[PDB]
Curated annotation (Swiss-Prot):
Entire protein: shown range: 68 to 406 of 406
General function of this protein: Renin is a highly specific endopeptidase, whose only known function is to generate angiotensin I from angiotensinogen in the plasma, initiating a cascade of reactions that produce an elevation of blood pressure and increased sodium retention by the kidney.
Disease with which this protein is associated in UniProt: Renal tubular dysgenesis: Autosomal recessive severe disorder of renal tubular development characterized by persistent fetal anuria and perinatal death, probably due to pulmonary hypoplasia from early-onset oligohydramnios (the Potter phenotype).
Record has Metal-binding as a keyword: no
Location of the Peptidase A1 domain: 19-332
Main location (coarse class): secreted
Provenance organism: Homo sapiens (Human)
Gene that this polypeptide is encoded by: REN
Protein name in UniProt: Renin
Location of the protein in the cell: Secreted; Membrane
Amino acid sequence: TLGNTTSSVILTNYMDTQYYGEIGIGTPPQTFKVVFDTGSSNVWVPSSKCSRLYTACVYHKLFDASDSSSYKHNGTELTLRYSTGTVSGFLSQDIITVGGITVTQMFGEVTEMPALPFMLAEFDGVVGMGFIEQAIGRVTPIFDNIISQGVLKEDVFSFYYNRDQSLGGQIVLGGSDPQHYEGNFHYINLIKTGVWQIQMKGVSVGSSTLLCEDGCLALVDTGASYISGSTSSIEKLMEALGAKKRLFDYVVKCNEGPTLPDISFHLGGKEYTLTSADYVFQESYSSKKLCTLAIHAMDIPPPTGPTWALGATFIRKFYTEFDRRNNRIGFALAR
Ligand SMILES: COCCCOc1cc(C(=O)N(C[C@@H]2CNC[C@H]2Cc2ccccc2)C(C)C)ccc1OC
Ligand SMILES: *[C@@H]1O[C@H](CO)[C@@H](O)[C@H](O)[C@H]1NC(C)=O
């Protein structure tokens, strides 16, 4: 069912690495800073029921079901395995406020939140923008619940991620905001419904298509800070860029940053190009300092992986529209 409503959620940009918005859970609302993640399908926040020995829980807003008059018990155990770290808890139902829309939602109350990476999170939890097919415990995702209300103008949602005291970013539910892109959208259909993954025809470092020569997978992940490939793809890519491995990232000598070649991603018709300004954290120009790159190795496990993941590094340059109606992703040059 379609209506007229488009709803927007203002995002906060934390150091070009974390982009989060705010949602309200319960009556009265308990507000949480949440990542709107297309790479996952579950909604979750840290629970009041989380032990004060998980230091992550000490530094994040906890959901207290005993303060909500709209809370409905469930209690089913839930383990959400991301490849950066793992969270577990149990299921709860309450009213979720997301940019003007009020939806009764089944979410996870996280009781096991590991310091790594959650002590580094500026966000409290996650709002999964992925499909039911990838929902742990087959829980109806928030977007499907909002689509059911028959209020949205279109069965689409869009991401705008800015570059780091202005607008950090914006999600528009039920359409796109033309103030944030220019030109026209170019769509690439999904390999299959259930995952925001598209076929990638090749990755070129410089003028020559050095990688993904015989085609590969590209997951459009709004919950990811960087553009990621498999350990092997990143090894070849990084050798071509002249980058050194450092444990958690890849660096180049700061002076070498601007001179690095453009990286292009063949998606659908078009070539989506990123210059060294689009992927280097140019914090200095010193030959005596090491500058990190906004491209990391990430081995996503099967069935979704092995795949490339186009995160915030990509979405910054290209405004993204996720079409639930036509099972496709659209890209336009961001403003
Ligand atoms: C751009 O800003 C967003 C936040 C970036 O910062 C952080 C992000 C994360 C993090 O990795 N994810 C889950 C990733 C992304 N989509 C699903 C999954 C990968 C995957 C795994 C398996 C299959 C598909 C995809 C979150 C959202 C829990 C952890 C710590 C962070 O900082 C401390
Ligand atoms: C928990 O929620 C699911 C629906 O998501 C439902 O089918 C199940 O019966 C619920 N269990 C309890 C204990 O309420």
